[PDB]
Design an enzyme around this catalytic site. Sequence first.
Site, mmCIF file in Angstrom:
data_model
loop_
_atom_site.group_PDB
_atom_site.id
_atom_site.type_symbol
_atom_site.label_atom_id
_atom_site.label_comp_id
_atom_site.label_asym_id
_atom_site.label_seq_id
_atom_site.Cartn_x
_atom_site.Cartn_y
_atom_site.Cartn_z
ATOM 1 N N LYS A 1 21.291 -3.158 30.884
ATOM 2 C CA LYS A 1 22.368 -2.218 30.387
ATOM 3 C C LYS A 1 23.512 -2.331 31.077
ATOM 4 C CE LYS A 1 23.530 2.187 28.329
ATOM 5 N NZ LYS A 1 23.570 2.258 27.053
ATOM 6 N N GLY B 1 15.810 4.828 14.122
ATOM 7 C CA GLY B 1 15.680 5.437 15.314
ATOM 8 C C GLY B 1 15.182 7.000 15.474
HETATM 9 O O1 LIG Z 1 25.533 4.285 23.371
HETATM 10 C C1 LIG Z 1 25.865 5.348 22.863
HETATM 11 O O2 LIG Z 1 26.061 5.192 21.284
HETATM 12 C C2 LIG Z 1 26.102 6.668 23.428
HETATM 13 C C3 LIG Z 1 27.279 6.810 24.172
HETATM 14 C C4 LIG Z 1 27.349 8.135 25.017
HETATM 15 C C5 LIG Z 1 29.016 8.545 25.376
HETATM 16 C C6 LIG Z 1 29.463 7.850 24.310
HETATM 17 C C7 LIG Z 1 28.651 6.835 23.600
HETATM 18 C C8 LIG Z 1 29.135 5.366 23.449
HETATM 19 C C9 LIG Z 1 30.060 5.109 22.471
HETATM 20 C C10 LIG Z 1 30.603 6.177 21.617
HETATM 21 C C11 LIG Z 1 31.530 5.761 20.567
HETATM 22 C C12 LIG Z 1 32.111 4.268 20.372
HETATM 23 C C13 LIG Z 1 33.195 4.159 19.259
HETATM 24 O O3 LIG Z 1 32.806 3.085 18.684
HETATM 25 O O4 LIG Z 1 33.908 4.839 18.738
HETATM 26 C C14 LIG Z 1 31.336 3.162 21.143
HETATM 27 C C15 LIG Z 1 30.582 3.530 22.283
#
Ligand SMILES: O=C(O)C[C@@H]1CCC[C@H]1Cc1ccc(C(=O)O)cc1
Lengths: 226, 227
Positions: free
Chosen positions: A38, A170
Amino acid sequence: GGTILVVTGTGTGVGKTVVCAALASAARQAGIDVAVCKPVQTGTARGDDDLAEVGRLAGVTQLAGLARYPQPMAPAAAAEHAGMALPARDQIVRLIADLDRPGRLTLVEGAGGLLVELAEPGVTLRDVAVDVAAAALVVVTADLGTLNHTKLTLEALAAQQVSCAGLVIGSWPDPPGLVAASNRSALARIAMVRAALPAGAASLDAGDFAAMSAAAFDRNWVAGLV
Amino acid sequence: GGTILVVTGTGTGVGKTVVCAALASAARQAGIDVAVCKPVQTGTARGDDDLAEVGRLAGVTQLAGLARYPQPMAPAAAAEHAGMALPARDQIVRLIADLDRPGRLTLVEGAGGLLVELAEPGVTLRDVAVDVAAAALVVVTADLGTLNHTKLTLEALAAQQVSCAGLVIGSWPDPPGLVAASNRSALARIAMVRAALPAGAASLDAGDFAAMSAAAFDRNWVAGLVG
Ligand SMILES: O=C(O)C[C@@H]1CCC[C@H]1Cc1ccc(C(=O)O)cc1
Ligand SMILES: O=C(O)C[C@@H]1CCC[C@H]1Cc1ccc(C(=O)O)cc1
């Protein structure tokens, strides 16, 4: 090398990490050596740590990351908030390439959906998948709207010739319900549904999670991954 | 013909209908003749009727439907549940072409997001936009996850050479939080943000809705849609 699989999703909060953990667990139980990369973690202020979830739920020890951002936002926004750049594309691809080895299943987890920026400048998990010749496992919801988001993600995979290794629901509800049941049949019509994890799987202890994972996936498919 | 715009979204419940109403209202206020058509309406057993809503909110009278299904599900599932077929591709094209007229803005409201099947087999609003040479107005949220869905949607438009007329944030919180403000800035770097409709716009009466709509869009852009 071995098998590199990006574990992506149609969006955020769809179960990517728990599916990453569940596949890792099933693979390890099939005797497969499993690593998880990751590269970027955000939301560390509130305690997010998806590698630790994989390590705790599946027993993976080869858990590789590069950057951790306090704010619970998309990597680019979290990096901007912190005033520090995301890692470089080369960092991510070389890390994955160095993790990869014959006989090993290396799962690669991004953040959010497929097209979100992971490395400066604007490089996504799809770019990384192209660079390391990984196929993509796509975590989907069973909820209203999953059909469009799944088709959007599959198109984006195919557009750069990234093979789709299947879908995983999921979080599968109990009992399903009309829309969830319909979505599962519709999803199976656009790609192989490799598993549908029971809702709440992410909170299980390691033992229950390994039993869930072994039951969630097809034994032969997991065994054939490497 | 005139200008045909499909009004799509990153997904379901993102504000497509209110945005369709808002654009219709702003265009009517520019003197532009507006027609709105909804090839596939589901959820009639719930009372869903996006055409009636656009008519109520914006005073559009030229409202054309085609397929209607009781259950509030994606068209294919609602049709399946009803024991009915989806319309054919040529029926959606005909419905739109019959509306298209010089000096008229014809809005085509999809169901759910861009790649939702609207006609058998697997025919989508993107296919329809190709058939009728329509650009696509993409309704987005400001919520977490909107950035990925918007980029997925814009890439799918570009994969078939469907021009993106811009984005509209279907509901804009006042005041915006950190993520919404970050998302709006990030969205504007992806494409033109034509409007951000204030939260609660759907609850406005005809007069307040018309005022909000005229305020929400650039009048030059709206007028520029239609020659
Ligand atoms: O991996 C996850 O989905 C959980 C993460 C926890 C904190 C924010 C999440 C990351 C993320 C959120 C919104 C967008 C967007 O495309 O707007 C892209 C990536
Ligand atoms: O137009 C709307 O978004 C509101 C409709 C109201 C009832 C169901 C909505 C249609 C829809 C739902 C899910 C999907 C999917 O892709 O799963 C595609 C289309």
